[PDB]
């Protein structure tokens, strides 16, 4: 029933459309969903998929460490 | 039991290291796996993940078809 990434109890749906953080977060909310939390995916196999996509805190999720206000990225919605 | 993409009984495991097609194909074979067939993913929701990665035919999987650097790849069919 999960057309995406299944991990524990959360299903992650990829939105391949590039959008700003504000538009991505609003788009997930329009589907009763939120952007991924970085601490719940950082140490898992999910990082290879969620890399460079929007995190819930307004920053891209990055494995190894600009203007995040108008940059545009892909994103997952979960929950 | 699938730490990747599950679609219709097949599990796709992402390999994030960039490899040539020959080494990507050998890496899947060493685990009794194959690269995705384009005909099995093209019209599905998998296409957004497997796009630009190696297909079994030696070409990258593209949404619309019609330059041999290293790419990421999925393995399936363990």
């Amino acid at each position, epitope marked *: 029933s999960c057309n995406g990434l299944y991990y524990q109890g959360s299903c992650y749906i990829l939105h391949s459309d*590039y*959008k*700003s953080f504000e*538009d991505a977060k609003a788009n997930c909310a329009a589907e009763s969903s939120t952007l991924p939390n970085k601490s719940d995916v950082l140490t898992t196999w999910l990082i290879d998929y969620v*890399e*460079d*996509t929007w995190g819930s805190d307004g920053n*891209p999720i*990055t494995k190894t460490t*600009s*203007d*995040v206000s*108008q*940059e*545009v*990225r*892909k994103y997952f919605c979960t929950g | 039991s699938c730490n990747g993409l599950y679609y219709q009984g097949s599990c796709y495991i992402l390999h994030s290291d*960039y490899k040539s097609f020959e080494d990507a194909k050998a890496n899947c074979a060493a685990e009794s796996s194959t690269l995705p067939n384009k005909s099995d993913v093209l019209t599905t929701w998998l296409i957004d993940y497997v796009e*630009d990665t190696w297909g079994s035919d030696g070409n990258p999987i593209t949404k619309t078809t019609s330059s041999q*650097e290293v*790419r990421k790849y999925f393995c399936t069919g363990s």
Partner: antibody
Amino acid sequence: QVQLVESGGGVVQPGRSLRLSCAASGFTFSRHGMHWVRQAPGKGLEWVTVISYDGIKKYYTDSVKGRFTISRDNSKNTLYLQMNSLRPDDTAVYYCARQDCGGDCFSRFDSWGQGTLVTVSS
Amino acid sequence: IQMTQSPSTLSASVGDRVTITCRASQSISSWLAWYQQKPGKAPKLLMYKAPSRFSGSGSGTEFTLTISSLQPDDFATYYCQQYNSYSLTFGPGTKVDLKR
């Protein structure tokens, strides 16, 4: 100090080819998408093409599709624009530019090269 | 899919509040930045952190640049930039010159 130095411009006859280069220094080249932008004499800026940080994705404006090819060499920190079937309307100053966002993204250009002149004329 | 900047030219004195508007025909996903270019030189990205006199405001079809206090260093041409559907586009440009 982020530096982008371009070369390869010059005068070339219509129908022939030219190759532009852009040497990058002062930043992690492999983590940033790169762009080419051109400006015809007396005209505005026109976006030409982008290549992703890892060289996988390339996109072009319509007027150069099939004629121009963007490429990059991350071990040499150099960006390339191979231009074929050059037309007189390709006459412009060409700039390379760096996206400031890291990885798979699109964003504003915070570093620009000094530009190199391309003149297409018989 | 037409992009216009109004006005194409404008005159202002040192110390004025200048507004440059850049519109689009439809929803263009996201406005990216404003750029300042002087003759003979490469364009320069405008940053809203320095007190910075530059401020951008984008609401769908409209993108606006505000220069709160103009100095003689700000007389140049300004270009908006936006991303839409795997491409980027600069606006036609607005030249700001010294009023007399």
